[PDB]
Design a protein around this nucleic acid. Structure first.
Length: 1014
DNA sequence: CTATGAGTGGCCCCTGTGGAGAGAAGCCTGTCCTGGA
DNA sequence: GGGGCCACTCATAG
RNA sequence: CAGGACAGGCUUCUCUCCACAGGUUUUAGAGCUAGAAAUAGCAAGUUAAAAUAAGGCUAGUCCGUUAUCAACUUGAAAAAGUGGCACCGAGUCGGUGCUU
């Protein structure tokens, strides 16, 4: 007997509740065979459970990482281009200059040359540092000096500018409103440049040097004043780097805001601080040359600086003068945003098409790459296809034929009522055409009043007319027609249908391209039809937007019997006056058949693909995929006998997918047979049912709430479509044996944390490069654990290197995953493991589960940390009492019910002791947090006289201790409780390892104690 | 007497801005139209 | 939020 | 009942590409005086290079944190197969009966 059964769903962002109920709303239970080497061969379990899992994440951070990687690569490539250009002359004076530059980061031991990067000697380095303390001094020198400078300094300055080229936010080259914008640019410069009157072509360097001089004088005055007046804090401010004083501001991690906050109260006390106070108010005190306010610098300033430097220095180095165009290109070149990555097809994010196959350089970009076809594919690859014509691209928003369609379709169902008319009448084709010609071609917008005055009364001589269908004014407008009438000024050309193709082509050309030159190039085919001024003004007009329909749909196909296009039908359709929607579904015409032929019998959509094809967060994609997997697994459990019904814009997608997978058989009339019906509901009804019948939901006690919500969803839906039931549900809610499963997942992402810590002496430092000793250069810390593997072997230990049989878990970082998978044995031996027993290697992902004595459970969080693996079960009556006490002062309802609930809360106050005792018993038995538990016990008797509502609310805080997963710290009234972290994983090495199905119904237990038995 | 492990408590986590485009979703109003019952 | 690491404290086995 | 379309307005979210500004680490930027040293005092502090997930080969001005992944068997992978039910009670499930 295939028992009638249904499956309900309660889908959340991280939670997917499932439950199967019979016609009596009862969840049955079955005995499941257990595989493995353990004595427990079969466990009976209830057909209810849920899956908790990590939230899905969007690739936005990954996209930022990719963009940053491209930024770094292209900046380095610019450096390489400059270095190659400078290479030829560099060899004559200093061949090791570029050799010194690349290897400066190395220690003196690792340097193959002298440690000084600039000159390779100390005396000249000191002289250079003395003459030009900052790079801005060198920049101002080069901008102002006419003298021939060393090429090394020139290269350094140019590389500095190139590496910090600045923003391209202002285009071009830098009446009354025009003078106003010039003054705005002057204000921008004054923000950038603080030297207003100096005769210089590079005011930015002057501004930086003036800032440095102010910093010097301010520091001198401040040190003098502090020494004179507050000697005790001298060493604190100026020597103690750990504080937010000057030492921390410059040498430590203290920033500008921190420095100002630290120094303001101190400056409030000494003499002569008025200027210092104002400077702090203007944020001009001791300003660094590298802040976050330099981001407003136009790249045109850097271009001018380069141009001036080259202008001054071209007289002595002819190769600089002859390569000035290339250097200016390197500084100025920006990859067009419509082109894309310069890949040879092998990059999944590349769309560029090449004219030739040479190496792309900033000097030969355009001639090698078809920017026209590049933008053509760029726009096209991101547009959509018509649903009725899957193989056709959509027309632009402002297509003239599209406007014709819109105007005619809006005018189609216009009903007019005049004197003597018993019923409203439709507009004839002649009437509609006359209306369009008289008003729409003359008015950018047409209202009801305008129509009544201009056509009904002036033309058809109807003194009184009633208009229906549109309230105020007609939405469709021939705005593009008005613009083309304004520009072309040839109404006969515009109204000639022989020009329809040309007009549509021009509109598409205007829509596709944003660059003026390409638009002019493509439209030059029509230069013989229009004058020069029209061509110029056409080069100026632009539009945006894309519609939903293609040219083929409206004017491409024709009816077999009549041959009228959709435009023809909308112009006049007889007395039927069928609009677009009516026309495309009428059986009397062949348009529907044309759409069906256009509809391609598509391949069975991959479940991975279709979920990846819906619009939404990837998190809901993961949730839906897991839910479908759960559905399939549950069906497979029941002998593949399909259920009756399912109760659940994600909902409709779930419904369609479930119907597609379940209902696949077609009847004698080729109609899909729906043996399973999808039932759609929302949370409001179920919450109302809960509040009506005291089935209260608490989201802090345990995770049984998800499964209970799914169970209620199914019950309510089945009852809706279709005493004892209340009691059955109550028994269901109190059932402790509930399948709670955390999805095991192999961790991905970054190799380690992003903080680069200073050098130390420990084995945990991770080298940033292959040839870089961590103790010499520091590196990363806290690598991310990929998963764990069980190893039973012998390891040499102690001074004597005595091999000792061991049984331990080694943490695999994500970075070394490939090396481990390539050859596990060699990778283990590289770590010193010997006599590896490969047959016993078990791969354990994160959240691996372990069974210990008395049912105590732990989840493998990482290599050396565990998580609580047990769930707190509480009786229903206590949950109801806690709910009533929690909302005791927030009751919203009839006063009688509120007073009854208050009396019930007062009567059973003694439940508090039972709750505390049960929590303490659970803690002692499975949690082992004796100190924190005793703290809680002391706190309970401390505040036993407190108001009941606060007591219950702070007890709700206590369930944080029994929460599954990572332990967390929480506060109880005035008592703070810290988190209990289990740092020892040795005990689970002899525990019971269980592997469960994604629903946990199928399971396999492996006893780790038996493995590696001596 | 030194090295090994076995808890305990405490602190640490890269951030900020611009431009271009395309798409989707929801809500509201009006005109509506098609499939079924 | 949640795991890792540092510094500190203490028992241990050789 | 659902769907679909046009227009207008509002809001929210998703994806791709082009950019800019910093920070971090390490090194360089002669520390001096008196004192054997511990140490005390003095002087100075704004800048510079490289890397910024280890790297790979398809050697490109490309790719490397999205997505996906219980266990066994087959399959390179993709993909496929692998485990009884009925009744009674319930503290992490247990008990009863039948076939296999």
């Amino acid at each position: 007997m295939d028992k009638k059964y249904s499956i309900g769903l309660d889908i959340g962002t991280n939670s997917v509740g499932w439950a199967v109920i019979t016609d009596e709303y009862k969840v049955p239970s079955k005995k499941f065979k257990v595989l493995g080497n353990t004595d427990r061969h079969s466990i009976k379990k209830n057909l209810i459970g849920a899956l908790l899992f990590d939230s899905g994440e969007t690739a936005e951070a990954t996209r930022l990482k990719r963009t940053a990687r491209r930024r770094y690569t292209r900046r380095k490539n610019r450096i390489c281009y400059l270095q190659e250009i400078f290479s030829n002359e560099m060899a004559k004076v200093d061949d090791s200059f570029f050799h010194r530059l690349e290897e400066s980061f190395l220690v003196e031991e690792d340097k193959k040359h002298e440690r000084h990067p600039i000159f390779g000697n100390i005396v000249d380095e000191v002289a250079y540092h003395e003459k030009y303390p900052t790079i801005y001094h060198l920049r101002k020198k080069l901008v102002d000096s006419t003298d021939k400078a060393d090429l090394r300094l020139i290269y350094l300055a140019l590389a500095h500018m190139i590496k910090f080229r600045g923003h391209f936010l202002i285009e071009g080259d830098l009446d009354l409103f025009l003078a106003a914008k010039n003054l705005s640019d002057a204000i921008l410069l004054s923000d950038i440049l603080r030297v207003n009157t100096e005769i210089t072509k590079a005011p930015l360097s002057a501004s930086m040097i003036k800032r440095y001089d102010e910093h010097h004088q301010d520091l001198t005055l401040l040190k003098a004043l502090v020494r004179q007046q507050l000697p005790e804090k001298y060493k604190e401010i100026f020597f103690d780097q750990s504080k937010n004083g000057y030492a921390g501001y410059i040498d430590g991690g203290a920033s500008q805001e921190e420095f100002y906050k630290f120094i303001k109260p101190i400056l409030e006390k000494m003499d002569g601080t008025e200027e210092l106070l104002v400077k702090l108010n203007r944020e001009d005190l001791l300003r660094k040359q590298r802040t976050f306010d330099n981001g407003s610098i136009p790249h045109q300033i850097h271009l001018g600086e380069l141009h001036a430097i080259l202008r001054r220095q071209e007289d002595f180095y002819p190769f600089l003068k002859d390569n000035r165009e290339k250097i200016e290109k390197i500084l100025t070149f920006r990859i067009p945003y419509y082109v894309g990555p310069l890949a040879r097809g092998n990059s999944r994010f590349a769309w560029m098409t090449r004219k030739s196959e040479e190496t792309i350089t900033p000097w030969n970009f355009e001639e090698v790459v078809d920017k026209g076809a590049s933008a053509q594919s760029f726009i096209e690859r991101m547009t959509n296809f018509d649903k009725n014509l899957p193989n056709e691209k959509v027309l632009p928003k402002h297509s003239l034929l599209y406007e014709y369609f819109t105007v005619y379709n809006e005018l189609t169902k216009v009903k007019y009522v005049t004197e003597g008319m018993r019923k409203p009448a439709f507009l004839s084709g002649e009437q509609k055409k006359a209306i369009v010609d008289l008003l729409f071609k003359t008015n950018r917008k047409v209202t009801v009043k305008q129509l009544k005055e201009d056509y009904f009364k002036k033309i058809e001589c109807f003194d009184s007319v009633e208009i229906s269908g549109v309230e105020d004014r007609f939405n469709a407008s021939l705005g593009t027609y008005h613009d083309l009438l304004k520009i072309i000024k040839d109404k006969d050309f515009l109204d000639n249908e022989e020009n329809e193709d040309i007009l549509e082509d021009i509109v598409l050309t205007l829509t596709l391209f944003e660059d003026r030159e390409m638009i002019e190039e493509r439209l030059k085919t029509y230069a013989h039809l229009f004058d020069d001024k029209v061509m110029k003004q056409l080069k100026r007009r632009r539009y945006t937007g894309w519609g939903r329909l293609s040219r083929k749909l409206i004017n491409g196909i024709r009816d077999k019997q009549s041959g009228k296009t959709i435009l023809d039908f909308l112009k006049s359709d007889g007395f039927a006056n069928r609009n677009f929607m009516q026309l495309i579904h009428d059986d009397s015409l062949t348009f529907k058949e044309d759409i069906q032929k256009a509809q391609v019998s598509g391949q069975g959509d991959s479940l991975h693909e279709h979920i990846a094809n819906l619009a939404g967060s990837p998190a809901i994609k993961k949730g839906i995929l897991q839910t479908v997997k759960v559905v399939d697994e549950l069906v497979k459990v029941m002998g593949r006998h399909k259920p009756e019904n399912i109760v659940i814009q994600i909902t409709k997608h779930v419904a369609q997918i479930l119907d597609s997978r379940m209902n696949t058989k077609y009847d004698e009339n080729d109609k899909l047979i729906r043996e399973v019906k999808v039932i759609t509901l929302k949370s409001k009804l179920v919450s109302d049912f809960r509040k009506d019948f005291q089935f209260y939901k608490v989201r802090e006690i345990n995770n049984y709430h998800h499964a209970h919500d799914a169970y209620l969803n199914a019950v309510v839906g089945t009852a809706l479509i279709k005493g004892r039931d209340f009691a059955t549900v109550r028994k269901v809610l109190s059932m402790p044996q509930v399948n709670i499963v955390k999805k095991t997942e192999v961790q991905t992402g970054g190799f380690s944390k992003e903080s680069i810590l200073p050098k130390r002496n420990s084995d945990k430092l991770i080298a940033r490069k292959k040839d870089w000793d961590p103790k010499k250069y520091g590196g990363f810390d806290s690598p991310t654990v990929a998963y764990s593997v069980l190893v039973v072997a012998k390891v040499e230990k102690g001074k004597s290197k005595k091999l000792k049989s061991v049984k331990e878990l080694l943490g695999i970082t994500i970075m070394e995953r490939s090396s481990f998978e390539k050859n596990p044995i060699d990778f283990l031996e590289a770590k010193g493991y010997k006599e590896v027993k490969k047959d016993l290697i078990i791969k354990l992902p994160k959240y691996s589960l372990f069974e210990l004595e008395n049912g105590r459970k732990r989840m493998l969080a990482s290599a050396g940390e565990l998580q609580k693996g047990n769930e707190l079960a509480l009786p229903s009556k206590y949950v109801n009492f806690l709910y009533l006490a929690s909302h005791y002062e927030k009751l919203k309802g009839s006063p009688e019910d509120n007073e009854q609930k208050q009396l019930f809360v007062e009567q059973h106050k003694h439940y508090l002791d039972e709750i505390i005792e049960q929590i303490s018993e659970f803690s002692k038995r499975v949690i082992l947090a004796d100190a924190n538990l005793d703290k809680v016990l002391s706190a309970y008797n401390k505040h036993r006289d407190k108001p009941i509502r606060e007591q219950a609310e702070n007890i709700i805080h206590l369930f944080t201790l029994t929460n599954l997963g990572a332990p967390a710290a929480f506060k109880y009234f005035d008592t703070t409780i810290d988190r209990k972290r289990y740092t020892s994983t040795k005990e689970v090495l002899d525990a019971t390892l269980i592997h469960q199905s994604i629903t946990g119904l199928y399971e396999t237990r492996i006893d780790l104690s038996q493995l590696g038995g001596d």
